[PDB]
Design a protein around this ligand. Sequence first.
Ligand SMILES: Nc1ncnc2c1ncn2[C@@H]1O[C@H](COP(=O)(O)OP(=O)(O)O)[C@@H](O)[C@H]1O
Ligand SMILES: Nc1ncnc2c1ncn2[C@@H]1O[C@H](COP(=O)(O)OP(=O)(O)O)[C@@H](O)[C@H]1O
Ligand SMILES: Nc1c(C(=O)O)ncn1[C@@H]1O[C@H](COP(=O)(O)O)[C@@H](O)[C@H]1O
Ligand SMILES: Nc1c(C(=O)O)ncn1[C@@H]1O[C@H](COP(=O)(O)O)[C@@H](O)[C@H]1O
Ligand SMILES: [Mg+2]
Ligand SMILES: [Mg+2]
Ligand SMILES: [Mg+2]
Ligand SMILES: [Mg+2]
Ligand SMILES: [Mg+2]
Ligand SMILES: [Mg+2]
Lengths: 237, 237
Amino acid sequence: MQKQAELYRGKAKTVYSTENPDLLVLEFRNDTSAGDGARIEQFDRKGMVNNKFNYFIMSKLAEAGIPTQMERLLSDTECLVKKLDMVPVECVVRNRAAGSLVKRLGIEEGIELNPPLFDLFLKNDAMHDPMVNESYCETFGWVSKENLARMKELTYKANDVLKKLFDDAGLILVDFKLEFGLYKGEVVLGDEFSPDGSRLWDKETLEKMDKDRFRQSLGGLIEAYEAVARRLGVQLD
Amino acid sequence: MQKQAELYRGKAKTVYSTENPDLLVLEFRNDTSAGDGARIEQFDRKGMVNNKFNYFIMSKLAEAGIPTQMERLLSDTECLVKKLDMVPVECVVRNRAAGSLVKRLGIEEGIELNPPLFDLFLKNDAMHDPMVNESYCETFGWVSKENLARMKELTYKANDVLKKLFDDAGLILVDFKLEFGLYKGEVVLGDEFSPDGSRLWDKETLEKMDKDRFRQSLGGLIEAYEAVARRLGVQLD
Ligand SMILES: Nc1ncnc2c1ncn2[C@@H]1O[C@H](COP(=O)(O)OP(=O)(O)O)[C@@H](O)[C@H]1O
Ligand SMILES: Nc1ncnc2c1ncn2[C@@H]1O[C@H](COP(=O)(O)OP(=O)(O)O)[C@@H](O)[C@H]1O
Ligand SMILES: Nc1c(C(=O)O)ncn1[C@@H]1O[C@H](COP(=O)(O)O)[C@@H](O)[C@H]1O
Ligand SMILES: Nc1c(C(=O)O)ncn1[C@@H]1O[C@H](COP(=O)(O)O)[C@@H](O)[C@H]1O
Ligand SMILES: [Mg+2]
Ligand SMILES: [Mg+2]
Ligand SMILES: [Mg+2]
Ligand SMILES: [Mg+2]
Ligand SMILES: [Mg+2]
Ligand SMILES: [Mg+2]
């Protein structure tokens, strides 16, 4: 398997086609974004860390019964994945108050959410991923009621599986974002799951070990990403 | 039934208690708000026009089977209503793109929405009525899943009724907001329906005849309100 041509690139990854019409190659670059693309910086080892982090997590979700895009890793920064007809809606689950929920509602950061909250956001950098809801998906044809219901079911299952996984690693899964796509008509988990798209707090100290370190100028971004990778059991070198 | 004392005064109306623990007096003032209370201005006849406009609309909705708060008109600006345990969530139906939808999604104004959209906003002027969804209602306990579903059901029914009503009046019901409350356990329509909380365009010229005239300083605010009153056949004098 080899990259055929660059299809398109986002804020952090490059998507390539392959000789196989149903397979794509995803490249995790060192580009790290904030403000939905307004601020982007490069961190060495970032793409590699996230590529291996994503493989590990998706592997765990797949074992739990969650259908994923993953085929295999091709290098430190690339992975072969099924070509998915992506639903341009980001699925977010919040176990504790943080980020936009805090700014938006004025809720105290760290408050535990029971049951957890579920947010739907439209993928539109220009508009800073505006919040939408189920009626929006039907009215604008982003995804059917049945597929959306599947997306929510799978997102919540992922939450259950990962909360345990991170707790086992002395980490608190605060919130996270998932993106799904259709493969031959079925809902499949695509994109990625990494510290770029989730908030992870050390269980005993509450120290942030995710992209917030970049969003909020705390420094030590990659060091934190790698610390979490190591706690999970991932060998970086 | 008469006013006893002021319980509280909102951006546009004043609520009074009565000898009856289950009845309140709503007083529509001439106060007209924009920016969620940031900019307020007074217009003569405004309170009276909306008070009577509201009674008329509530009546039409009642005759359609929608349970409402309304008891009776008391004066040009006052009406008697059932005391409701208000749900702090604004319910919005959008038939055509306008206002915050256009602002949030960068979508074009006037675009027809099929089916119509349904937005839920937390009632909090301080935070500018932030958009929420059903999960927030469950987690923060603003309203039971059952009652919420009834709120949406009634709102959509109100839309079916009023679209017909306004269309016959040569007008386009672009969007609108409703507030519900609990009365002895049952979900009841409260607050008001007027040009203050709805968008109404002339079917032929698409001229805005609602509070956007105030929001956008287009002049002729009440003239437009009364024009709508006349097309509906609302007695004002
Ligand atoms: N398996 C897949 N098939 C097709 N597109 C995918 C797949 N997984 C992810 N994508 C898309 O590829 C892009 C990944 O690049 P990224 O830099 O994350 O983009 P963005 O700027 O939207 O965050 C996204 O648009 C994502 O939806
Ligand atoms: N039937 C009712 N019973 C109790 N409260 C009501 C009823 N109808 C409306 N209210 C509440 O009374 C207030 C009406 O006044 P208004 O000036 O519109 O207020 P606000 O500035 O809060 O929007 C609102 O807070 C509304 O929720
Ligand atoms: N990574 C992204 C993006 C994005 O990249 O557009 N949107 C949300 N998220 C992730 O979802 C959670 C909630 O994000 P917000 O608090 O900003 O809504 C966080 O873990 C975040 O990293
Ligand atoms: N009047 C209000 C309020 C309010 O007063 O807070 N919130 C929504 N609305 C009405 O709902 C529709 C959508 O409003 P937005 O476009 O602001 O979301 C409009 O008809 C508006 O007047
Ligand atoms: Mg992305
Ligand atoms: Mg995004
Ligand atoms: Mg986003
Ligand atoms: Mg009001
Ligand atoms: Mg409001
Ligand atoms: Mg509002």
